[PDB]
């Protein structure tokens, strides 16, 4: 029963494997060979943001291109104005080890979570003055490593208990639950049409999901170690990953195989966070060796280095208009590049 | 007009900045301690005084913060990484023994935990179990330079000094001197185990300063 079940599946692997090669027609490096690069184009630290004590583990941008949110192990969420560098708000927390945070595209709720196995939802409308917690979503057993917002009513979370679980805040319970992965789920990014999403997991894999159907759509395995950073292309057709072995990859959501890898022999630490430029040409990623790295997506060539930091980075992102790119790192410092 | 907010934000920002200056220093009031292991009775006898359990206590007007993980998954390689700000790791033991070595060893060789110190606690006063595990235990001399616990059979005290020296040939095996282990046996004794920590966190924060002045 089990011996045939392993026997059919390795044939079902080869049923997918050699049929995956049926669309392997050329390479991406063969067919971008004509374009000029962007060249050595380097940003500059425009502002610097200093309010945090402990290591800033995660940030998230705004939908207005004006504000951003950040959290660190001291236990403070803080909403930073990017323009004047004036802090809009500060929130105490009951746990400390906030491993992720999120900023809704209504601008009226923010959220966070961590080793407390609880995804707090915070209110920013605040008819009485300061902020307060709306509720919290205790339906997990591992920890929470990423969370995102669909509207002001439902959020999708990552997991230390292998199961990405989408919520509904008025119910306060999981509508659905995705039990596909094997290890830990680190990062997830929402699609540009808020309909699908992918999730990077600790088994060198990522499974495309659906928030309506709840099935497991696809699976992409090309990494050698656990994945930590994963984000969508702006068009809605591709996503680029980064694992803990200094390999940035590229896949496609139609061809269903990988396209382009990004590596260099002088980089030995692991990738931590990733983001994309507005026009999708430039790929940006940070590392553990205390500096960022800006890549072309097409030629697979490093084109920018943002070396202002002096501890390991953990979180970054390009704004929705692409006006700037901000990074955070374990020295509690937030550098905004342009 | 445009500067109507400039009397708000600056006078809101300095409300935040005056608020955090109580918290920049009360962070330095306490000392974080990560307590971990694989066991229950030795782990829930230091609860003498969810997702993660949390307690707090103070001695000699100095307050501590123990953070023992409760409902957590057995794969440890990603929620260990958020624990290098801790002043000291308390590691409690309770063939558990050889498997407890690599749970200590791979902490000691971890890239992010290189700069943090490890306290220890030996429970489980075991004789047939030890030479069943390690063959070269029969070769062992009891340390006489180390005083024994007075009034005990010298095979009981000898195996106590086998594992205590087994960690130390792993701890000092190319540690280079950025962090120091602190072996202690308090096997299920209704005693302090507080001054045996309060003195030994002090030796950690002492040797950090002499390290910063290039004196160690």
């Amino acid at each position, epitope marked *: 029963e089990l011996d045939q079940l*392993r026997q059919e599946a390795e044939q079902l692997k080869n049923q997918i494997r050699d049929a995956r090669k049926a669309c392997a027609d050329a390479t991406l490096s063969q067919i971008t060979n004509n374009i000029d690069p962007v060249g050595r184009i380097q940003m500059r630290t425009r502002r610097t943001l200093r309010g945090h004590l402990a290591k800033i583990y995660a940030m998230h941008w705004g939908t207005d291109s004006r504000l951003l949110v950040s959290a660190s192990q001291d236990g403070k969420l803080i909403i930073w104005d990017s323009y004047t560098t004036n802090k809009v708000h500060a929130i105490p927390l009951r746990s400390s080890w906030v491993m992720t945070c999120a900023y809704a595209p209504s601008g009226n709720y923010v959220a966070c979570g961590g080793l407390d196995n609880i995804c707090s939802i915070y209110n920013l409308k605040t008819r009485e003055g300061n902020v307060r917690v709306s509720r919290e979503l205790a339906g997990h057993t591992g920890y929470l490593s990423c969370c995102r917002f669909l509207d002001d009513n439902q959020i999708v979370t990552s997991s230390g208990d292998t199961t990405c679980a989408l919520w509904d805040i008025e119910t306060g319970q999981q509508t659905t639950t995705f039990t596909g992965h*094997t*290890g830990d789920v680190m990062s997830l990014s929402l699609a540009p049409d808020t309909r699908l999403f992918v999730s990077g997991a*600790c*088994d*060198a894999s990522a499974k495309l999901w659906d928030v309506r159907e709840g099935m497991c759509r696809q699976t992409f*395995t*090309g990494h*050698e*170690s*656990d994945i930590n950073a994963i984000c969508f292309f702006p068009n809605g057709n591709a996503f680029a990953t980064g694992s*803990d*072995d200094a390999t940035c990859r590229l896949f496609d959501l139609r061809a269903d195989q990988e396209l382009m890898t990004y590596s260099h022999d002088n980089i*030995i630490c*692991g990738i931590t966070s990733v983001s994309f430029s507005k026009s999708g040409r430039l790929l940006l990623a940070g590392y553990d060796d205390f500096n960022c790295n800006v890549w072309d997506a097409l030629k697979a060539d490093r084109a920018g280095v943002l070396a202002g930091h002096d501890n390991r980075v953990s979180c970054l992102g390009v704004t929705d208009d692409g006006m700037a790119v901000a990074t955070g790192s374990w020295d509690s410092f937030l550098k905004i590049w342009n | 007009d445009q500067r109507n907010e400039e009397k708000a934000q600056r006078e809101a920002n300095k409300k935040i900045e005056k608020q955090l200056q109580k918290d920049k220093q009360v962070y330095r009031a306490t000392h974080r301690l990560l307590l971990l292991g694989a066991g229950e009775s030795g782990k829930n006898t230091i609860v003498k005084q969810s997702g993660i359990f949390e307690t707090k206590f103070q001695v000699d007007k100095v307050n501590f913060h123990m953070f023992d993980v409760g409902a957590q*998954r*057995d*794969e*440890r*390689r990603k929620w*260990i990484q958020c624990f290098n700000d801790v002043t000291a790791i308390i590691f409690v033991v309770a*063939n558990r023994l*050889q*498997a407890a070595l*690599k749970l200590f060893d*791979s*902490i000691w*060789n*971890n*890239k992010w935990l290189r700069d943090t110190s490890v306290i220890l606690f030996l429970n489980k006063q075991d004789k047939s179990k030890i030479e*069943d*595990y*390690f*063959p*070269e235990f029969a070769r062992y001399t009891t340390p006489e330079d180390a005083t024994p616990e007075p009034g005990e059979d010298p095979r009981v005290t000898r195996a106590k000094y086998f594992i205590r020296d087994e960690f130390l040939r792993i701890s000092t095996a190319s540690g280079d001197g950025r962090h120091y282990c602190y072996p202690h046996f308090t096997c299920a004794v209704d005693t302090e185990n507080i001054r045996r920590v309060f003195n030994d966190c002090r030796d950690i924060i002492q040797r950090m300063h002499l390290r910063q002045y290039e004196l160690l």
Partner: nanobody
């Protein structure tokens, strides 16, 4: 792709001798430190042996000291383990595991809950 295949197992009466090669592919084998693990029926898992990246440092569990040897062939990415002078209390399901990260000797892999880089398993009957 992470595929940790094995070759061995079988009947042994106490005093026999047998080998184990863990053939595996999918990554740069020279950048990884490799290690074995068994589990008795009725007990948990326990680390038995390892090897470093170069092959220099070698360690064993005390109860299996001097009776097993562990090596690799980094050219054709295998993992050779030789079992000599068998003992009746060593019948257990074995695995061939990999430490998660490259370039560093720290490992957290003995756990039960589907560690992502242990093989499909073997079985020995002593």
């Amino acid at each position: 792709q992470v595929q940790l295949q094995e070759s061995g197992g079988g009947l042994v009466q106490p005093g026999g001798s047998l080998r184990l090669s863990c053939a595996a592919s999918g990554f740069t084998f020279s950048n990884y430190k490799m290690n074995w693990v068994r589990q008795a029926p009725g007990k948990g898992l326990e680390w038995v042996s390892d090897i470093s990246q170069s092959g220099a440092s070698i360690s064993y569990t005390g109860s299996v000291k001097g009776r097993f040897t562990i090596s690799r062939d980094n050219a054709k990415n295998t993992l050779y383990l030789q079992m000599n002078s068998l003992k009746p209390e060593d019948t257990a399901v074995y695995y061939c595991a990999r430490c998660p990260a490259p370039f560093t000797r720290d490992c957290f892999d003995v756990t039960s809950t589907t560690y992502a880089y242990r093989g499909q398993g073997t079985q020995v009957t002593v």
